[PDB]
Design a protein around this ligand. Structure first.
Ligand SMILES: O=P(O)(O)O[C@H]1O[C@H](CO)[C@@H](O)[C@H](O)[C@H]1O
Ligand SMILES: O=P(O)(O)O[C@H]1O[C@H](CO)[C@@H](O)[C@H](O)[C@H]1O
Ligand SMILES: [Cl-]
Ligand SMILES: [Cl-]
Ligand SMILES: [Cl-]
Ligand SMILES: [Cl-]
Lengths: 908, 905
């Protein structure tokens, strides 16, 4: 069987875990230690691309490399034995039905491997976690227990294989760079500090030190060390059967030894020990990365002294419990509520790993992309709202004056990097996500004033959305847009938003939809920059323009403001205010955009125009209406079989991608999602889209595919079609897009369809027989039902947000709290209750929905709402109940405040 | 217990070979299949940086990765068993004293792993080689033998783990790129053809196909396949304990199956077989790389049909025997004579591997560097002369009009590439080696006319020896030096040579020796381009100038010609012909060089001057004499203990590198070698140098170190000092430099000292207990006595050349054959003979030296010489006996012609 949850805090257990390929669990802290641990203690440990403590790995390494973390016991009358089962002898029992009993347990945020040797009568339990302290450190505790009837004599040896340099050195100059190693032994362990680093940064002095240290439970140091890998393993040996352990050799080194020029292993030999029947002995090992030589005394006192491991583990458990208790779901699906706690962890992991340094994520180098700056705000708005305002303001510094944006993110707040040499890529969807995220912030917080903050615009060598290079640019002008007088231009946050959505409107292909450029959301649609079109994201931009129009009008009626400060050159793009052009003409839209580019390159005038907020809203509505009409009139398609949906793409030959085709209908999920979400699709078109999706995309084994099968490579569209069908962006169940589809369905009132979609993701993810993953939502479910690219996927943010804001219906409306449950009957528990604890206006609320009548969605309404005891007026704007912000703000800061919403049946 | 030679052809055997870490053996062909094989059949298989059939590896992989080539037998009553010992079960016996008996045998050019299972009564023998056909293919034959008293029932499964893409994908996008895999099964095996390649070339369509195919001895196809790696190994399995084999599962796939998106393994399941007591069964596996889908029928007919393996192996043995029989040594040291046969193989390997794609050589990408263009000619002149003239002419196309040279070598003959990635590096020694190699060609061949062939000069954005960028440069100027009128300038080969040696003469540092620039021979001396000086290579350039002077004079007296065609601008550099400058002035030498650079940048005039050959020789001699005087007067140094030698370097602070120092004397071998070789060092200075070398550099465990210990990193000198002492260019016994030291000693008559040096390299290399290498000379012997960077080192070329041309003394003199033995008494065999078979003027000669008087070197002379029977005039008393080229050319083409040289007191 799969894993089974234990207790009510999200802890789980998996029996015989190493009977599954490619499993791994994450251990990480804010300080920057990033680890992965497999059932046999393989994985990796790193603090960045250039500073790997253990060897860099991909998926195949987890079986093929012998260099796991290990801890050995030489058992008298038996021999060498690995506490995680990673020895030649133990591995040779796999598939013979003579395997030792074993298990993984894990929680927030820690991991435990158990193993039993019935022959010798020994049990081992090895706990890994990364402390929540300001050090880059991983700790290991091995506890050995004599489960037999007589004394055992054991000789323990810890062994953490070291790498201690850049992943650039994996093979390229791998051996040469081993010659730069300097190993220093001391009382508690082994430090490795290369003299130099050779990697893509060049040849440089290194001070970075990688440390492996250990002690018995009582604080007693190791008896000695085998710091040199080839000496530890022996001539013709290996890390899963090393001579030093197998032949029980005396230590090569004591404290104060230096050794130069060899690959290193943190091999710590402990004193031999006699273990009474029933009694235990424990060992603590620490793996440390530091910017210089390590104060080994301080680390020994903080991590290896008696009871430090146990105390730090409690500290770790409490810190993570505190992070995750910001969102708690409670329903008739107890297994799913606890599964969602792991989903709730994932957005934090993506931040702390920088979408990198786990075995599948083998290409990542730790940075953040443009999308992450926005996506990371979604989890934060729900879990840690305080930080979000600062992050959004800074993010808008990266926008260029042509609507595009910096694609390389820097160290500082609002720091972005120019790449003046590389042939650079524009993703056409990059302008769409900021508004969506910002709108969410406005509705949760009520902070409408954010839209009128000043901010600069990014500027580098690339202009006209990276079509041309600029001649008159030097390093002396700096990375910000200048005025005629040479000053840094600043526009409203709103001016930035306008620009990001208006520019794409005019940037149309030969079929009238917005150009694909380098790709949209789908990174694999990278081969149609000349003639490609993302109809899919045209519906997103159309919807954004309409929301912008509604937003401006609502700013007038709430703020009172009549005016918008916008740069004079942007007035060209708001042509409804001057001499309107025909939006039916492609030539005219292109020409007007070329005029705009010329007006703002290399500099702007600096002069701003002050425009009527209602007249600007009218321009935005006109554009939106045009796009809505064109999409419905020109990109609504039907197969001969009678299904109908929206074409999502035109390829680099100007050909429509979707519809009937030799070898089968071509359809994409991406082409439907934003049409539905934003209102381009009518209700009738949404019913039809769902049927076409269910017909062409919904697989009975793997769920809602990102696209149907296109035969072979598609070199006029994208490299994604080089992937085998059902993998990555070619037809896998790609969680992010699928969650957004569900989100869109819920938004539009298609609740049963939306539920089916969300429930599919959970069922696939948790069907361990096929998925072979721990709790969490993967990036994708593949052709064989396996969970791929675990933990770091952005889909988790959306899953969390969709459950909170759509399914349980707890969301903001200009800072006021709206309650609009879209829960189905089957989600209510044995007392007809389903609840969510969440943060809103700086207070923890337990929103409990009571459905005593057991009504299905559509058959229920809100009958009453009581807040912490007393009654509440729900001044109901539309289909749900609306509570004013002040009533929540008036609550006590401490404690969880209960808000009981009673549901009853409809009339008539 | 090391390896032991067997027979007289250089075949060897090693018992319990996998009791040694990091061992590997090379298998390679001209077609481009490049392989390495370890005692457990690990290593790698590739046709280039971007086309790896098996996973790319470094040293640590050879133990740490489970993905060796493998062949499994599921033995009834026993279970899974690897014919090479690479299974979890078999590995778990290591260090328990329950290991199975095993062995490697190898020869030219093939490899054999044997193993015995005493429990089951089964012996396996697995032979690997690369055929000498026009395909990129490696073959494996596994022969299983029942050594027990009752029948065995066996189920065989071959398993070659596939990678099938660029080494760029090793980790970076490793998994993503697995999704591009397309696996096709057919009757005889498995093809992998990725739909696309993602690597440093970009995202592209791929057609390259990687194939694993197999058959029984009779040509019977496999019963089926497990083409998908994760299915073959099983959930929680591994390539050294795969479920498909361990649980004896039925095949996943038959012929005609396609599978997309997974890592692949060439896992071929053969029919179960009952093996009688005493009898054998064999299997042939073929690993193929092709530019498109493979014609599997043709490969099956050519490689898998009955008796094809055995026939192709004979063909391989004969081809290599024929390549290596061009040089054969025979002496009182039989083990060394056979060891040298392996040394003789190495230059061919360096060419065919492009100094890459063996486990230690983990940074190489298959290309050639500037030095290789010259070094590769040394082995060729002795083993395959025909190609050499063309290679030299083409090589000179790479020289720039400032004496520097292109550093990136291209596809075509004489094609050189301009560096698109900024970052230009000049190695100051690059101008020195061409003359040394060319002179050797002139003396072996007699083809003095080569020096007057026309050739272009390379041109790119970088000028003044890559100090400045050129303003008036576009793609529009092209890759060749233009004249004022816009034509491609062509100069004599000799004009190129002059320029390469004269420019460095003026390119001096603040201490008056030639600037280090980006590094010299030592690639690790890369941190003193501003103020560094290579005194070491100043002695080389000084010697080159003198040889050039002697050469020009000898051209007059042999060709008859009195003139040299040289570009007018080069006359500035031959200042003795116009207004001489003072060579004692650094400022004046620098200024004259800056004038020259200005005269030739961006273009030359095209007009040539015709200069007196004797007056040019006079200019060259003047320079040489100046450099010889300055080095002896200013760079001869002494420690307080009283040892004396030549300072080799100034560092980037303008400080002298060598001499007394806190924590110990600093001395380099490189600073001595060319001083000795070229005559800068007098005989007395050479005696003293050898004593200082022996005192400071000669380690009793590891031999002649490249340098003594400098404490810690040396950031004003080179990155080499970041290496642990005794590794790579920081104080290891670095074979190339050590061989050249020996060469220099022999050249100067220090024969006992030279012998000690050459014998040290052999003894260290062959002391397997410490060296842990197969026969051959390594790049270096390290601090623990281990042989490192095997096979591909350029030291082998020099070792071969030094044994032939100095030790046995068989060398050219303007095409005439000179015999000048420098053999010591102990090298003569039991009949007082030592001999060498070698190619000269297109004929195989067996030069046999007879020393009946048992005289030591220095006490013997040449008393008579007979050629195939009749007597020979030796037109020369002094140093050696000199035989005219015609007498050799008059011999029959076929056959080995004996030339008996009798030595007396
Ligand atoms: O892993 P994730 O976040 O689910 O999704 C990943 O692939 C998507 C499709 O190419 C991109 O839009 C995301 O930026 C990327 O992180
Ligand atoms: O491996 P090899 O050829 O013995 O020697 C290697 O290192 C030397 C010292 O840096 C260089 O001069 C050679 O060009 C290089 O190939
Ligand atoms: Cl056992
Ligand atoms: Cl990155
Ligand atoms: Cl056994
Ligand atoms: Cl290369």
């Amino acid at each position: 069987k799969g894993w089974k949850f234990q207790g009510e805090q999200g802890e789980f257990r998996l029996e015989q875990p190493e009977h599954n390929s490619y499993l791994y669990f994450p251990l990480v802290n804010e300080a920057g230690m990033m680890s992965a641990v497999t059932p046999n203690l393989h994985g990796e440990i790193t603090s960045g691309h250039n500073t790997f403590l253990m060897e860099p790995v991909s998926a195949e390494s987890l079986h093929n490399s012998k260099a796991s973390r290990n801890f050995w016991v030489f058992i008298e009358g038996y021999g060498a034995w690995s506490v995680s089962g990673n020895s030649a002898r133990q591995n040779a029992a796999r598939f013979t039905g003579e395997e030792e009993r074993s298990a993984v347990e894990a929680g927030f945020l820690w991991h435990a491997v158990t193993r039993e040797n019935e022959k010798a009568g020994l049990k081992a339990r090895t706990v890994s976690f990364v402390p929540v302290t300001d050090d880059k450190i991983e700790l290991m505790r091995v506890t050995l227990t004599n489960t037999g009837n007589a004394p055992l004599k054991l000789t323990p040896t810890a062994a953490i294989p070291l790498y201690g340099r850049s992943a650039d050195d994996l093979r390229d100059h791998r051996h040469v760079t081993s010659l730069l190693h300097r190993i220093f032994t001391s009382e508690y362990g082994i430090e490795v500090q290369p003299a130099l680093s050779f990697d893509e940064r060049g040849h440089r002095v290194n001070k970075v030190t990688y440390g492996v240290f250990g002690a018995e439970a009582g604080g007693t140091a190791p008896a000695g060390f085998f710091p040199v890998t080839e000496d530890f393993i022996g001539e013709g040996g290996a890390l899963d059967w090393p001579e030093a352990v197998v032949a029980n050799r005396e230590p090569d080194a004591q404290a104060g030894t230096a050794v130069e020029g060899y690959e290193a292993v943190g091999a710590l030999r402990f004193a031999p020990v006699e273990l009474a029947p029933g009694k235990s002995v424990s060992y603590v090992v620490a793996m440390v990365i530091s910017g210089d030589r390590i104060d080994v005394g301080r680390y020994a006192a903080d991590y290896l002294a008696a009871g430090r491991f146990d105390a730090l583990l409690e500290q770790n458990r409490a810190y993570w419990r505190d992070k995750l208790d910001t969102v708690r779901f409670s329903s008739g699906d107890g297994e799913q509520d606890l599964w969602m706690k792991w989903v709730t962890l994932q957005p934090i992991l993506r931040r702390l790993y920088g979408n990198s340094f786990l075995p599948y994520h083998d290409y990542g180098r730790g940075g953040r992309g443009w999308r992450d700056l926005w996506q990371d705000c979604l989890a934060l708005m729900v879990m840690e709202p305080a930080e979000v305002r600062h992050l959004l303001l800074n993010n808008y510094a990266g926008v260029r004056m042509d609507g595009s944006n910096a694609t390389i993110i820097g160290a500082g707040p609002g720091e972005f990097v120019a790449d003046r040499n590389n042939i650079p890529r524009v993703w056409m969807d990059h302008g769409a996500w900021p508004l969506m995220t910002t709108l969410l912030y406005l509705h949760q917080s009520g902070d409408l004033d954010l839209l009128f903050q000043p901010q600069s615009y990014f500027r580098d060598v690339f202009v006209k959305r990276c079509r041309e290079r600029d001649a008159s640019w030097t390093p002396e002008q700096g990375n910000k847009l200048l005025t005629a007088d040479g000053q840094i231009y600043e526009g409203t946050i709103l001016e930035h938003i306008l620009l990001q959505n208006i520019v794409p409107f005019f940037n149309v292909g030969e079929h009238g939809n917005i150009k694909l450029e380098g790709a949209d959301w789908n990174d694999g649609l990278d081969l149609a920059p000349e003639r490609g079109e993302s109809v899919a994201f045209t519906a997103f931009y159309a919807s954004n323009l309409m929301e912008l129009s509604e937003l401006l009008l609502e700013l007038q009626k709430r703020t009172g403001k009549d005016s918008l400060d916008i740069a004079e050159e942007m007035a060209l793009l708001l042509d409804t205010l001057g001499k309107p052009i025909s939006y039916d003409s492609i030539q005219e839209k292109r020409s007007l955009l070329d005029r705009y580019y010329d007006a703002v390159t290399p500099r702007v005038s600096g002069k701003k125009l002050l425009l009527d907020i209602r007249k600007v809203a009218e321009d935005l509505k006109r554009k939106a209406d045009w796009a809505v009409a064109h999409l419905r009139g020109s990109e609504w398609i039907q197969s001969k079989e009678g299904y109908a949906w929206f074409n999502g793409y035109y390829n680099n030959d100007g050909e429509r991608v979707e519809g009937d085709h030799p070898d089968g209908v071509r359809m994409t999920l991406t082409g439907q999602v934003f049409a539905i979400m934003g209102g381009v699709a009518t209700d009738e078109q949404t019913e039809k889209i769902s049927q076409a999706v269910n017909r062409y995309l919904k697989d009975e084994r793997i769920g809602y595919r990102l696209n149907s099968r296109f035969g072979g490579i598609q070199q006029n569209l994208g490299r994604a079609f080089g992937f085998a069908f059902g993998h990555k962006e070619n037809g896998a169940m790609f969680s992010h897009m699928t969650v957004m589809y569900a989100n869109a369905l819920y938004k539009r009132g298609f609740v049963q369809e939306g539920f089916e979609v969300l429930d599919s993701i959970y069922r696939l993810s948790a069907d361990f027989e096929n998925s072979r993953i721990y709790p969490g939502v993967p990036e994708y479910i593949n052709e064989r039902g396996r969970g791929m690219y675990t933990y770091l996927t952005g889909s988790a943010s959306w899953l969390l947000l969709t459950q909170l804001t759509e399914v349980y219906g707890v969301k903001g409306r200009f800072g006021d709290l709206r309650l609009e449950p879209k829960l189905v009957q089957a989600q209510f528990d044995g007392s007809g209750e389903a609840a969510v604890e969440t943060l809103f206006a700086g207070r923890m609320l337990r929103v409990v929905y009571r459905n005593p009548q057991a009504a299905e969605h559509g058959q229920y309404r809100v009958d009453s709402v009581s807040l912490n005891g007393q009654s509440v007026d729900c001044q109901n704007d539309g289909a749900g109940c609306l509570i004013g912000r002040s009533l929540i703000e008036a609550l006590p800061a401490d404690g969880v405040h209960e808000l009981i919403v009673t549901l009853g049946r409809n009339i008539s």
